[PDB]
C-alpha cells in the first residue's frame, strides 16, 4: 500500500507516552485488585 | 440350584453401557415372583436368582426408594 506522511506525526517521545499510558490502563486496576486479594477474602 | 453365584452374568437383553433397565427388570421380576409365590402359598426361594441379580446391580438408594414407594402405594411399575 502507499500512503501520505503522517498529518500529525507521533514522535518517539509521544509514542512512549501513549504506550506507557496504554499499559498502565490495563495493569494498574488489575494490579490493585490482585494486590488486595487477601484483603477481600477477609470481609 | 446354580449357586456358586459370583456376580450377575452378562445378559444379552442388556448388552450396552446403560444398565439401568437390567437393574429395573430384575427388581420387578423378583418382586413379581415373590408376589406370585407368597400368594399361591409357595416358596419365595424360587425367586432367589432375581434377588441376587438385582442386589448385585442396583444402587442401594434405588432399591431403598423403590421399596419405600411399594410400601406407600406409589411404585409406578406393575407388580
Amino acid at each position: 500500500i502507499t500512503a501520505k506522511p503522517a498529518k500529525t506525526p507521533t514522535s518517539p517521545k509521544e509514542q512512549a507516552i501513549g504506550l506507557s499510558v496504554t499499559f498502565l490502563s490495563f495493569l494498574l486496576p488489575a494490579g490493585w485488585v490482585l494486590y488486595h486479594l487477601d484483603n477481600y477474602k477477609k470481609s | 440350584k446354580i449357586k456358586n453365584y459370583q456376580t450377575a452374568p452378562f445378559d444379552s437383553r442388556f448388552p450396552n453401557q446403560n444398565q439401568t433397565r437390567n437393574c429395573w427388570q430384575n427388581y420387578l421380576d423378583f418382586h413379581r415372583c415373590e408376589k406370585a409365590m407368597t400368594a399361591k402359598g409357595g416358596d419365595v426361594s424360587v425367586c432367589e436368582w432375581y434377588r441376587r441379580v438385582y442386589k448385585s446391580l442396583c444402587p442401594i438408594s434405588w432399591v431403598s426408594t423403590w421399596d419405600d414407594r411399594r410400601a406407600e402405594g406409589t411404585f409406578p411399575g406393575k407388580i
Partner: protein, 144 residues
Amino acid sequence: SVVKSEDYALPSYVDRRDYPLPDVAHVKNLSASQKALKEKEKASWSSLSIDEKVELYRLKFKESFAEMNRSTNEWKTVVGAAMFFIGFTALLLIWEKHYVYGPIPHTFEEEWVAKQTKRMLDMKVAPIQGFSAKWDYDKNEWKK
C-alpha cells in the same frame, strides 16, 4: 509526483517487480528541457547521453528494480523489540510472584518430596517406562 486521495478511481503508479510496466508514467508533467528530452527520444537512442537515458527512466518510473527490491534492517528492530516486550512480561511475572502469590503447599518442602519419592517408588509408580523404571531396585539408586 504528488498523489491525492481524491484520485483513487484513476489509473495509478506502482513499483511491483511482477507488474513491471505500470498503468501511468511516474512523472506526467514535463518542463521545457524534459519536453526537449522526450523529443530527442524519438531519434536514435545511441545519441542520448547516459544522463539523458537515466532521466528518461526516472520520468517513466519511480524506483528501479534494485531499489524496490532492497532488503532492510527492519528484522533487527522487530526481533529486538519483541524480545524487549517479552522481557517486560517477565517483570510483570516477578511482580505477580512477589505481591499476588502466597506460599505454595507444604508438600513441596524438600523432605516431603524425598519421602513422597520413596513412596512412589514403593508403589512402583510407572514401573514400565515412566518413573520407577528409572530406579535401580537392586543397587538402591537412580539408574545411570
